[PDB]
Amino acid sequence: GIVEQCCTSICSLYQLENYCN
Amino acid sequence: GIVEQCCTSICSLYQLENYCN
Amino acid sequence: GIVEQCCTSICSLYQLENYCN
Amino acid sequence: GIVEQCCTSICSLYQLENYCN
Amino acid sequence: GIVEQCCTSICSLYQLENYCN
Amino acid sequence: GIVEQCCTSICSLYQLENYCN
Amino acid sequence: FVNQRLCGSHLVEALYLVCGERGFFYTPKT
Amino acid sequence: FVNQRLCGSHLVEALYLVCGERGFFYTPKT
Amino acid sequence: FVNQRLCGSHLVEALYLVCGERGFFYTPKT
Amino acid sequence: FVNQRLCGSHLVEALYLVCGERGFFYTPKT
Amino acid sequence: FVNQRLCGSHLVEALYLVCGERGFFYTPKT
Amino acid sequence: FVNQRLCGSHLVEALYLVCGERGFFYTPKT
Numbered sequence: 001g002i003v004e005q006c007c008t009s010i011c012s013l014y015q016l017e018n019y020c021n
Numbered sequence: 022g023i024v025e026q027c028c029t030s031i032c033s034l035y036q037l038e039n040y041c042n
Numbered sequence: 043g044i045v046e047q048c049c050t051s052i053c054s055l056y057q058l059e060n061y062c063n
Numbered sequence: 064g065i066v067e068q069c070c071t072s073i074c075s076l077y078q079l080e081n082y083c084n
Numbered sequence: 085g086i087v088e089q090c091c092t093s094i095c096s097l098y099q100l101e102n103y104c105n
Numbered sequence: 106g107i108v109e110q111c112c113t114s115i116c117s118l119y120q121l122e123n124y125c126n
Numbered sequence: 127f128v129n130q131r132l133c134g135s136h137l138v139e140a141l142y143l144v145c146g147e148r149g150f151f152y153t154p155k156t
Numbered sequence: 157f158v159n160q161r162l163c164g165s166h167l168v169e170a171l172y173l174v175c176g177e178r179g180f181f182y183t184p185k186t
Numbered sequence: 187f188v189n190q191r192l193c194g195s196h197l198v199e200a201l202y203l204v205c206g207e208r209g210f211f212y213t214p215k216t
Numbered sequence: 217f218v219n220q221r222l223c224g225s226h227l228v229e230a231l232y233l234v235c236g237e238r239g240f241f242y243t244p245k246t
Numbered sequence: 247f248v249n250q251r252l253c254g255s256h257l258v259e260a261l262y263l264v265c266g267e268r269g270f271f272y273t274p275k276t
Numbered sequence: 277f278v279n280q281r282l283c284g285s286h287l288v289e290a291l292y293l294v295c296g297e298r299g300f301f302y303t304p305k306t
């Protein structure tokens with residue numbers, strides 16, 4: 001998931017936005 | 022809500038458990 | 043400055059981009 | 064010690080409590 | 085105490101050295 | 106640079122001071 | 127434990143510490 | 157914006173900044 | 187995105203998140 | 217609560233949250 | 247250096263930065 | 277003071293504490 005991707009890889013703020021309410 | 026009892030007032034780590042999934 | 047629009051007021055992450063090099 | 068254990072291994076909040084005044 | 089001179093007032097990193105072991 | 110040195114190696118607060126305005 | 131004040135990002139940091147792998151939801155509007 | 161590596165509490169801080177008043181869900185794998 | 191309040195170290199944390207490898211300058215005096 | 221990995225400043229933040237007004241001692245090895 | 251305001255967890259973060267391996271004590275009550 | 281390892285946002289926090297009102301430039305390599 002995003003928690004794993006962001007740490008083992010890299011992620012964008014746009015991808016993080018998918019997890020806003 | 023979680024805010025009304027932490028920033029304006031005070032809250033315990035025990036109460037924070039209420040917001041875990 | 044960056045402060046006059048973030049701590050005293052409010053600022054967006056978009057505006058923060060103005061301070062990147 | 065606790066500083067090393069928490070980083071090289073894992074630790075609980077209960078173990079951390081042993082270091083409160 | 086350390087608080088009375090940092091949050092309510094202001095303190096320097098030099099003064100913080102006073103609390104190292 | 107300092108950003109790389111501080112993370113891959115170690116750095117002092119005095120070295121960091123070289124990057125204050 | 128004790129009770130304390132947790133504002134902004136400090137509250138989410140605390141939720142992360144308390145919930146960890148269980149995950150959590152941060153909903154200011156509620 | 158740019159891509160970045162966000163581990164542990166740093167990811168939660170990033171979610172807090174990106175989502176703001178909208179709030180967010182932090183859901184790690186198993 | 188949205189707008190929010192960022193004071194002290196929280197502002198520099200946000201600049202780091204937004205700028206990343208591009209770098210940034212933090213100038214309070216300005 | 218849950219177990220977790222706490223390195224560097226993150227451990228100090230955790231101690232601050234757990235101990236609160238009680239305060240704490242941060243004592244790393246040699 | 248200069249002088250600044252350090253509240254809550256920010257104070258302990260600063261103590262960690264300044265003391266490091268020497269360790270430190272955080273005692274609000276004192 | 278002591279030497280230390282500062283990665284990611286932790287370096288920015290350290291610069292903020294050391295520089296204070298003076299401000300600073302965060303400039304990572306390529």
Ligand SMILES: [Zn+2]
Binds near residue numbers: 166226286
């Ligand atoms: Zn970290």
Ligand SMILES: [Zn+2]
Binds near residue numbers: 196256
């Ligand atoms: Zn804060």
